[PDB]
Amino acid sequence: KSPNVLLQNLCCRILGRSEADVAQQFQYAVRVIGSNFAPTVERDEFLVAEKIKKELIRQRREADAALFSELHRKLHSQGVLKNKWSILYLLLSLSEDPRSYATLFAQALPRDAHST
Amino acid sequence: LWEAALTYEASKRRCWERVGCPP
Amino acid sequence: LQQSLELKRKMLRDKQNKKNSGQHLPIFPAWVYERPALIGDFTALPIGTLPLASQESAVVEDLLYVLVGVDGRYVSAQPLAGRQSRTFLVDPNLDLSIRELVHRILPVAASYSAVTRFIEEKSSFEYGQVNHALAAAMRTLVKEHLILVSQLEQLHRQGLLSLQKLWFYIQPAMRTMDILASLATSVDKGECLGGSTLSLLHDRSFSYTGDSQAQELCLYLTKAASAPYFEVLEKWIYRGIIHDPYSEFMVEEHELRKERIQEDYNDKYWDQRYTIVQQQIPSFLQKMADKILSTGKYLNVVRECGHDVTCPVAKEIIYTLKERAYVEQIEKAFNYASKVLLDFLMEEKELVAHLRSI
Amino acid sequence: MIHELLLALSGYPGSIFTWNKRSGLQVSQDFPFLHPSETSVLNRLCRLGTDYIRFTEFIEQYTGGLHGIYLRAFCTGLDSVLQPYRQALLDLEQEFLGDPHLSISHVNYFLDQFQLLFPSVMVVVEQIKSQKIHGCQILETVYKHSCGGLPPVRSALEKILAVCHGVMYKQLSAWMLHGLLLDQHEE
Amino acid sequence: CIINTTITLAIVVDKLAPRLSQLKVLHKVFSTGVAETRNVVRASHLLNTLYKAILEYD
Amino acid sequence: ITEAALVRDILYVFQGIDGKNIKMNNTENCYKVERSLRDTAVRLSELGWLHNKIRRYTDQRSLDRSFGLVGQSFCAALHQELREYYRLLSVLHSQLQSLTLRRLLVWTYDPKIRLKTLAALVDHCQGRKGGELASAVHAYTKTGDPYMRSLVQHILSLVSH
């Protein structure tokens, strides 16, 4: 498939509808996904792993923070995933706490120092 | 399509003389 | 480096002869101080650095070591810690542009070594309850400083890093470690323990108010250092207890039961038993400092006979800037201790009938 | 030594982990392809296999000590207490079946909970062998260590005490109820 | 279940534990019934050994 | 010789074992290697020196029956803290086959503060038994450091039982 047809499958997955029904939200999804296609930060899985561990430690779930360390190695063990940074960066962002400041902590490199 | 084929019925067989990729 | 052991012995003796009821106050063993391990500081091509384009790549990896505590092949850390401004020795025969350039980068290396020593020194038992927490809040800021340099080293593996690129990258770390080194030396130089190290952080929060980058670091360190001191206030304002194993609180309790017992000769209590300590007020609680002492003063004279303290407030007290919550929580338990002790005195052992009989 | 180690810890030796009646399981210490540090971790794991081979030899030899019933109840308790070590070994086998390269530090972390329980029950067997502890004094012998203070060790010896209390209650429900004793040379 | 799940030596021996326990009793019970010439003593001794050997296991 | 050999060397010396290029196992003063070589090994080997101390004590204390009910339980809690350090050594070995995160300093930062606390609990509780032994574990939990506060107060809950 292509990403343009594949975005419409996502709009039919989240909103339970057919592609002939939902077309105003897909119109918005093309606006935000298009013109923001290229990756803006330098890719490294190490910083994202050390942030998912920090997040799982912060919720007093210290047992899952080192189970993630055994789950992240199997991704490298199998080896059919090309961009492991992007999917982890996405899965960290959609994370909810079952139950502040970030300019102080470690952030990704801006890619602006290089002549892109 | 491939993730749709990925929902298949798996064979849970194994031997000692077959360690790597032995379905 | 050794006069700190003298300092630790003096503060040891002070807490020891002060708090005479409990078991001996905790200490570290001596080797924790005597290790050079815990303090962060402790074939190489003799071509006289001929090749001009390779000099940048050689010195920048020596820089990637020197940013985080390690002497380089060409840069070298001088054997001070006599002073605290730890200077470095670059190789003489360098490109002067490069030698000057790493001279501009080395202040973040010097402002790192004076931070790790502060956290290593003020994590000892003699420095109270709050100067422990001030050296506690700086280490999450040490973590990011290391993470940048490891990411730059792994980028340097690909050859896509320059000395100018590195000098561009480290600009936030040059500021943040400098504010931590300023706070470290300001707590060390003027001896600041307990409430005195809670005043100085509140002063630097007013120094940086319009930057909003150095303010947020400093305001984070204030709320983190205010956690033990305000928790003693969370007992002393609501109950008569000051648990205070290191005498850092604004209120100390004298054992002047020794002179005045079974007859209160001084009628001891208001005058000589409960005193306020002036240097251990954190300079933002001066406004009700008399009321803080009198609040717990009103509770314990009930606690002498009435075992119950029945404070229904039990309000969590914490430092906040811009917004004054810790004034009225003091006023609430001050109103309650005053109301209980008064109405106790007027209903129970009534004062109108005794004055009538006088 | 990934499968030979699970086999030697299963109690079947092999001429890397050379069984010696003096030195239990013993690696033969001179290898040009591995080196002295992993040798030490292997020796540390061979302590557990040494204890397991001595336990299974004691149970096979005395399931019927010198002859008789109260220590017969002791061994029937003892193999059932050693059962989770077997089943944890069988779980290691499935995990090494799943992944082809897992460490010894992986095995060490999984078996360091039996690394404690085995030398603690060794002294419980050793006092019975040394003092020729006859009949109902075995009940006292396991109970004075049922004041253990490793909580796994206390519970593991409690299971053995419950088992051999079974044969104590069995003889007592004969003599208190039908009036006859049922004891040959034990009491 | 061999011909139709993984199976090894170390699984089949632990599966056959409560059977290999019962066979060892037969190795000692039959050993007295094979070690003996008249037809009355060879049956009387055999039948008496069983009544002794179960009272061992009570 | 290479820093990769130094990595696998220093990983076994994390366990405290004698390695290839670093020889001295705190017999005379401390661990010594024989510039990534000297200084980084002299960094990381002190975690194995910590391993040597807090495991020497519990290897002796589990072999002493006179230590009592409150100190075989103290010996149980000190073992529970060591198993998770071997878990960290397990993940340290598994990422080798990069794993040159400045020679594992973030990976061995969270052990070293915990181990210098466990070594403190070891050598302050040396010689004490009975109700005096739980008093020394309580003589560490006025530490405002919550990583050290939540550690010893967890060890108090196992000792005080």
Side-chain angles (χ1 to χ4, degrees), chain A, chain B, chain C, chain D, chain E residues 1-35 37-58, chain F:
Chain A
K1 294 183 185 173
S2 70
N4 45 53
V5 171
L6 187 58
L7 275 166
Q8 201 179 244
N9 293 349
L10 193 60
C11 309
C12 304
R13 280 312 305 188
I14 313 296
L15 290 167
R17 271 172 179 88
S18 87
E19 54 258 14
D21 194 299
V22 62
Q24 66 289 331
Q25 306 264 52
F26 179 50
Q27 182 173 331
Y28 151 78
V30 170
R31 303 317 186 86
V32 284
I33 289 296
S35 317
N36 199 266
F37 207 61
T40 79
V41 297
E42 298 263 358
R43 52 180 212 96
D44 54 330
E45 62 185 2
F46 161 64
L47 187 144
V48 189
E50 284 285 342
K51 287 166 71 176
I52 300 174
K53 294 189 200 84
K54 191 188 306 298
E55 160 79 1
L56 289 165
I57 284 290
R58 205 189 36 85
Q59 320 177 209
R60 285 309 86 191
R61 214 193 307 169
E62 316 205 327
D64 289 18
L67 167 66
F68 166 71
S69 172
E70 313 173 2
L71 295 167
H72 183 225
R73 198 259 318 161
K74 297 178 186 169
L75 262 63
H76 298 80
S77 290
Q78 294 149 11
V80 308
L81 214 58
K82 206 64 64 190
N83 270 312
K84 319 175 197 299
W85 156 75
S86 278
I87 183 56
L88 287 177
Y89 201 101
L90 193 148
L91 285 176
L92 167 67
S93 48
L94 323 183
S95 288
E96 298 84 359
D97 207 323
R99 285 296 74 191
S100 59
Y101 60 95
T103 174
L104 284 69
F105 293 144
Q107 308 290 336
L109 295 190
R111 270 173 78 102
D112 297 335
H114 206 63
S115 324
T116 303
Chain B
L1 73 172
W2 196 22
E3 289 84 5
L6 167 156
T7 43
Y8 66 101
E9 176 273 338
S11 156
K12 303 325 296 164
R13 192 190 174 277
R14 186 63 88 113
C15 172
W16 288 94
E17 290 153 347
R18 288 249 282 154
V19 181
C21 322
Chain C
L1 252 135
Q2 167 354 51
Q3 69 289 20
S4 22
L5 282 74
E6 266 82 25
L7 287 171
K8 286 186 297 282
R9 183 50 55 89
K10 304 313 152 42
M11 302 154 187
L12 261 185
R13 289 173 189 192
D14 269 18
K15 308 302 180 168
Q16 274 10 307
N17 47 38
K18 168 70 186 65
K19 302 285 303 182
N20 284 276
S21 25
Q23 212 158 339
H24 286 332
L25 271 297
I27 49 178
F28 284 83
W31 67 272
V32 186
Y33 314 122
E34 299 219 335
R35 283 324 163 193
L38 275 70
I39 298 99
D41 290 75
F42 309 96
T43 77
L45 42 102
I47 197 91
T49 56
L50 293 186
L52 256 319
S54 124
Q55 276 178 256
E56 283 103 18
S57 200
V59 179
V60 78
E61 70 179 0
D62 298 16
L63 233 149
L64 276 166
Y65 299 139
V66 86
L67 288 152
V68 291
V70 183
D71 329 333
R73 321 304 89 68
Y74 306 141
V75 299
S76 266
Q78 294 283 79
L80 67 167
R83 213 16 234 203
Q84 281 101 42
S85 230
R86 284 198 59 247
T87 186
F88 297 92
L89 183 146
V90 307
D91 262 13
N93 59 355
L94 214 58
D95 186 21
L96 322 172
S97 134
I98 303 309
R99 168 218 43 87
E100 113 58 54
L101 195 48
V102 312
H103 285 344
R104 200 152 295 158
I105 309 182
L106 277 172
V108 72
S111 82
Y112 176 70
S113 330
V115 172
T116 183
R117 282 185 283 157
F118 162 77
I119 304 164
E120 274 289 344
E121 183 71 31
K122 305 307 191 305
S123 184
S124 171
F125 279 110
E126 297 95 341
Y127 301 100
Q129 279 101 344
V130 172
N131 195 26
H132 273 119
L134 180 51
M138 300 195 176
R139 284 250 147 188
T140 180
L141 317 168
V142 173
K143 287 187 173 185
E144 31 109 312
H145 168 64
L146 298 171
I147 286 174
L148 174 145
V149 185
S150 252
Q151 182 177 39
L152 259 65
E153 175 67 87
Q154 196 273 336
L155 182 77
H156 180 267
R157 281 304 182 270
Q158 292 181 347
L160 209 64
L161 187 145
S162 115
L163 186 67
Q164 169 45 55
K165 284 180 190 178
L166 188 125
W167 170 235
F168 172 63
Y169 300 149
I170 72 145
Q171 297 306 294
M174 185 153 280
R175 179 178 204 186
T176 30
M177 296 305 301
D178 191 67
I179 311 299
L180 290 190
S182 74
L183 287 172
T185 18
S186 74
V187 168
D188 194 16
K189 176 212 206 137
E191 279 101 22
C192 275
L193 294 192
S196 55
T197 180
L198 198 43
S199 358
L200 164 64
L201 308 175
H202 189 72
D203 162 66
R204 307 299 300 276
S205 320
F206 283 158
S207 74
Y208 297 104
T209 205
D211 307 1
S212 313
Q213 306 175 358
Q215 181 172 39
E216 285 304 308
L217 179 135
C218 213
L219 182 61
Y220 167 64
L221 258 60
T222 54
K223 295 162 189 168
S226 314
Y229 196 96
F230 270 104
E231 270 163 24
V232 194
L233 195 86
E234 282 170 11
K235 301 178 191 60
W236 163 248
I237 301 299
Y238 305 94
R239 298 174 285 166
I241 320 178
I242 38 170
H243 69 338
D244 223 44
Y246 318 109
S247 153
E248 79 168 26
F249 206 71
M250 45 206 306
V251 180
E252 63 177 337
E253 176 197 358
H254 293 145
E255 294 158 330
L256 274 185
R257 210 59 81 164
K258 56 200 182 264
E259 284 296 325
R260 338 282 170 196
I261 185 173
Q262 183 39 65
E263 69 274 14
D264 47 303
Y265 177 66
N266 177 230
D267 295 330
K268 49 172 166 77
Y269 177 121
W270 280 293
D271 297 20
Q272 297 177 14
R273 202 180 179 276
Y274 262 112
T275 62
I276 192 74
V277 204
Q278 49 10 295
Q279 83 262 14
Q280 292 295 320
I281 302 170
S283 66
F284 53 87
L285 291 178
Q286 294 221 359
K287 228 175 304 211
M288 322 82 74
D290 198 314
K291 276 188 173 179
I292 284 173
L293 163 72
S294 102
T295 305
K297 175 176 284 186
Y298 280 0
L299 294 153
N300 196 8
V301 276
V302 192
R303 298 172 82 257
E304 200 261 5
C305 43
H307 183 2
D308 49 42
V309 302
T310 74
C311 203
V313 176
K315 193 37 182 154
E316 297 317 287
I317 332 186
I318 66 154
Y319 172 82
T320 43
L321 194 67
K322 273 61 171 179
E323 172 277 277
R324 313 269 82 88
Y326 46 84
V327 272
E328 342 144 288
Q329 299 170 41
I330 296 315
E331 304 321 305
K332 281 155 64 177
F334 171 65
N335 286 237
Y336 189 73
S338 283
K339 180 59 176 298
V340 167
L341 176 57
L342 179 57
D343 150 27
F344 181 82
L345 195 68
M346 292 312 131
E347 109 204 29
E348 272 165 321
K349 277 76 64 179
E350 74 287 337
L351 213 49
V352 187
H354 279 250
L355 284 181
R356 276 179 206 173
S357 124
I358 282 175
Chain D
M1 56 182 175
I2 8 227
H3 199 351
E4 201 78 51
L5 191 57
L6 312 181
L7 169 89
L9 288 185
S10 279
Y12 321 106
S15 101
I16 290 302
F17 306 94
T18 58
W19 169 258
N20 273 333
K21 200 71 198 76
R22 229 260 352 190
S23 74
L25 290 185
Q26 179 54 51
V27 72
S28 55
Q29 185 64 253
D30 53 353
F31 292 115
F33 22 75
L34 61 91
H35 263 289
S37 146
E38 55 258 47
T39 307
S40 62
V41 201
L42 280 160
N43 286 127
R44 275 205 70 257
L45 298 147
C46 282
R47 308 171 168 272
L48 267 175
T50 300
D51 300 335
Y52 181 75
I53 294 167
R54 291 183 184 273
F55 290 161
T56 54
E57 183 178 0
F58 159 75
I59 286 169
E60 173 261 346
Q61 206 201 352
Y62 308 153
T63 205
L66 201 156
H67 288 139
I69 190 67
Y70 264 88
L71 249 174
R72 181 179 292 273
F74 191 87
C75 18
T76 58
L78 185 53
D79 56 68
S80 49
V81 165
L82 297 168
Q83 187 54 244
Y85 164 72
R86 307 210 177 98
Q87 162 88 15
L89 203 50
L90 298 157
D91 230 287
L92 289 180
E93 276 147 22
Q94 217 78 12
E95 282 195 65
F96 277 80
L97 193 60
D99 181 88
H101 287 283
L102 304 160
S103 253
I104 281 181
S105 225
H106 187 261
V107 180
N108 192 10
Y109 153 61
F110 278 172
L111 266 294
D112 204 10
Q113 77 168 33
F114 296 95
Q115 190 67 241
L116 277 171
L117 175 60
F118 281 52
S120 83
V121 307
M122 187 49 201
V123 310
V124 183
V125 183
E126 187 55 49
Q127 294 187 3
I128 300 171
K129 285 191 307 176
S130 46
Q131 299 174 330
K132 319 279 292 184
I133 301 193
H134 150 64
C136 297
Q137 283 282 337
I138 307 173
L139 293 157
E140 269 194 65
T141 314
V142 69
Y143 186 77
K144 297 311 169 187
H145 316 133
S146 309
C147 197
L150 296 137
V153 171
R154 156 143 197 184
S155 59
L157 300 185
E158 280 171 352
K159 294 292 300 308
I160 294 171
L161 181 57
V163 165
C164 146
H165 266 169
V167 78
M168 190 267 288
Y169 276 65
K170 181 62 66 67
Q171 298 183 319
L172 185 139
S173 6
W175 196 76
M176 272 195 44
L177 275 297
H178 292 73
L180 299 175
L181 60 89
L182 284 179
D183 240 338
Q184 284 72 42
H185 73 266
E186 296 271 82
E187 310 303 334
Chain E
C1 64
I2 304 307
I3 318 177
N4 307 324
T5 170
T6 188
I7 282 300
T8 179
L9 300 168
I11 297 174
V12 68
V13 296
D14 192 272
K15 188 173 286 191
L16 286 169
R19 286 304 195 167
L20 299 190
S21 88
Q22 290 184 340
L23 213 49
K24 185 58 71 171
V25 169
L26 264 74
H27 186 42
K28 269 298 189 177
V29 163
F30 162 72
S31 291
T32 70
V34 66
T37 57
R38 305 172 60 174
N39 81 310
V40 61
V41 61
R42 291 165 59 199
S44 280
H45 175 38
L46 165 80
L47 197 60
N48 202 11
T49 315
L50 265 64
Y51 169 65
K52 272 167 53 185
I54 309 175
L55 287 194
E56 189 198 347
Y57 277 96
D58 200 2
Chain F
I1 79 171
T2 112
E3 60 92 20
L6 288 178
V7 157
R8 56 161 309 273
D9 191 3
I10 278 308
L11 191 145
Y12 287 124
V13 180
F14 281 163
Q15 193 176 0
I17 314 167
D18 192 16
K20 162 71 176 167
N21 291 335
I22 172 165
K23 299 179 178 67
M24 302 284 324
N25 312 118
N26 53 68
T27 0
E28 297 124 351
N29 179 45
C30 201
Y31 277 86
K32 287 302 164 303
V33 101
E34 288 162 9
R35 281 281 295 97
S36 299
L37 176 103
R38 298 179 178 174
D39 299 3
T40 65
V42 165
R43 188 142 210 176
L44 293 149
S45 203
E46 310 308 309
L47 187 55
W49 189 93
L50 279 161
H51 176 273
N52 285 128
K53 288 300 181 177
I54 101 126
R55 219 223 216 151
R56 178 256 305 168
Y57 168 80
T58 184
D59 189 80
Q60 296 170 4
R61 281 304 153 274
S62 288
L63 275 269
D64 184 28
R65 320 296 167 187
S66 102
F67 205 45
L69 211 72
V70 79
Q72 284 140 47
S73 17
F74 184 72
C75 204
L78 199 79
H79 287 159
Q80 282 191 16
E81 293 291 327
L82 213 92
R83 266 207 291 271
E84 180 160 337
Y85 173 65
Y86 298 140
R87 165 188 212 187
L88 201 141
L89 297 197
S90 299
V91 65
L92 255 50
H93 198 94
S94 346
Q95 305 185 4
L96 192 46
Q97 154 71 289
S98 85
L99 189 60
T100 175
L101 165 49
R102 188 83 68 222
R103 312 278 317 262
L104 294 166
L105 295 176
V106 187
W107 277 105
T108 74
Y109 175 69
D110 287 30
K112 231 187 191 164
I113 288 162
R114 199 185 307 190
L115 263 293
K116 72 184 182 181
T117 300
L118 288 154
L121 207 23
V122 157
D123 226 335
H124 184 59
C125 280
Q126 199 76 255
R128 299 184 195 194
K129 77 180 189 62
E132 211 170 14
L133 188 58
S135 66
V137 188
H138 186 63
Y140 270 153
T141 158
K142 289 164 190 82
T143 307
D145 204 63
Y147 184 76
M148 188 174 177
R149 179 180 289 174
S150 82
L151 180 62
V152 183
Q153 205 178 344
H154 179 60
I155 299 173
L156 195 153
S157 60
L158 301 154
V159 164
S160 261
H161 186 272

